[PDB]
Amino acid sequence: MDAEPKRKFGVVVVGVGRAGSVRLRDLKDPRSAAFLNLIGFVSRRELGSLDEVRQISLEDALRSQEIDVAYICSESSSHEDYIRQFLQAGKHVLVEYPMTLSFAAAQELWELAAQKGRVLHEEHVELLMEEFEFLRREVLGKELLKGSLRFTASPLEEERFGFPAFSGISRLTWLVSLFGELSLISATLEERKEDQYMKMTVQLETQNKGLLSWIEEKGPGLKRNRYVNFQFTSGSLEEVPSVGVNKNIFLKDQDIFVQKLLDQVSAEDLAAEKKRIMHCLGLASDIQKLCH
C-alpha cells in the first residue's frame, strides 16, 4: 500500500475452472489492463503461481487491502458464501450467475452490498450474445402468442451447480429480458436416474398472457443445443443466426462491471437490473418448489 492515488483496481479471482481461467486470461487484455490488475487468486486446487502472481488463501484474500475486487468463479453452490465473505471484507464483487441458489439469500446479499457501499454484479453474458441482440430486435413491436425455448446439454451435478431452474437461469433470463416479467403457471421435472436423464418443463405467461414453455433437458446423449420457436400474432420465429462462442464476451461483461466500479451506471439502470435479477431468482426458487 502507498498513499499516492492509484490508477487501477486490484482483483482477486476466486475459483479457477473454465470461468476463472477466462477471467484471468481477460485480465491480460490491454484496454482492460488500463483499469484493473490481478493481485492473486484463490483455488481449492494447488496451482501455486499463475500469470506471475502467487495463489493465496481465502483468509489472505479477505484481509488484503491491496485487493479492491473479487471475481467469484467457484462452483455455484459456494457462490453465496464467498460473496457474503468478500462483501463483509469490503470488496466489490463480480460473480458468475447464479449468484445464489436461494432467493432469500440473494436478498440478504443485495442488502449487504448496499450497506457496505460495494458493487455486487451478477454476470449474465447470455444477454450479450449476438443472437440475443438479434432476438431483441426481432420481437420489437410484435406480440407473443406462444413460444418455447429449450436447452439440451449433458448432465450437471445438482449438488454443485444447482437445481436446473438455477443452473439454466440464463435461458429464463433471455425470456424475461425479451418478453418482460413473467407469471409462473406450472412446472414439472422428470428424472430417469438409470439413464442419467432430466427434463424440466416450465409454463410461464407474459403479462399479456402469451404462453411460454421453458424446457431444460439434460442427458449423456444430448448434443448441446438451443431451440427457439416464437409465434407472434404477426408471424413466427424459429431460426436465429448461427453464431459461434465469442472469446471476448466476458470482457464485455467486465466493461459493465468497471462502469459500475467508476459509478457510471445510472440508479435507474442499476435498479432495473437488480429487479430483473431478483425476479428470475424468485421464479427459479418457486419453480424448484413446484417440482418437489
Domains and CATH numbers, the chain: 1-123+245-265 (3.40.50.720), 124-244+266-292 (3.30.360.10)
- Residue 281 CA to residue 103 CA, distance in Å, equals 6
Give me the half-sphere count of Cα atoms (radius 13 Å) on the Cβ side of residue 50.
24
Way the structure was solved: X-ray
* 159-to-75, 167, 231, 285 alpha-carbon distances in Å: 10, 11, 36, 15
What pairs with residue 153 in β-bridges?
A: 218
Give the integer Cα–Cα distance in Å for 44 and 162.
Answer: 19
CA atoms within 13 A on the CB side of 119: 27
Whether the ω angle into residue 98 lies within 30 degrees of 0, i.e. cis, is: yes
Active site residue 71: no
96 assigned to active site: yes
Q: What is the 3-state secondary structure (H, E, C) of 24-53?
A: HHHHCCHHHHCCEEEEEEECCCCCCEECCE
Distance CA 161, CA 146 (A): 30
**Which residue, 108, 29, 23, 93, is CA-closest to 278?**
108
Distance, in Å, from the CA atom of 65 to the CA atom of 257, rounded to the nearest integer, reads 20
C-alpha cell at 145: 402468442
In the chain, which residue ranges form alpha helices assigned H by DSSP?
18-27, 30-33, 58-63, 79-88, 103-116, 130-139, 158-161, 164-167, 169-179, 249-261, 267-291
| Resolution at which this structure was determined, Å | 1.4
For the stretch 75-104, what's the b/e string if a residue is b when 16 or more beta carbons lie within 10 angstroms of its beta carbon?
ebbebbebbbbbbebebbbbbbbbbbbbbe
Q: Known catalytic residue: 118?
A: no
Instruction: Calculate the alpha carbon distances from 282 to 72, 185, 188, 207, 287 in Å.
Output: 21, 14, 17, 17, 8
Residue entry with cell 482477486: 12
Grid look-up 406462444 returns: 146
Annotated binding-site members for NAD(+): 18-19, 76-79, 97, 167
Q: How many alpha carbons lie under 13 Å from residue 137 in its C-beta half-sphere? A: 8
170 flagged as catalytic: yes
Largest CA distance in the chain: 63
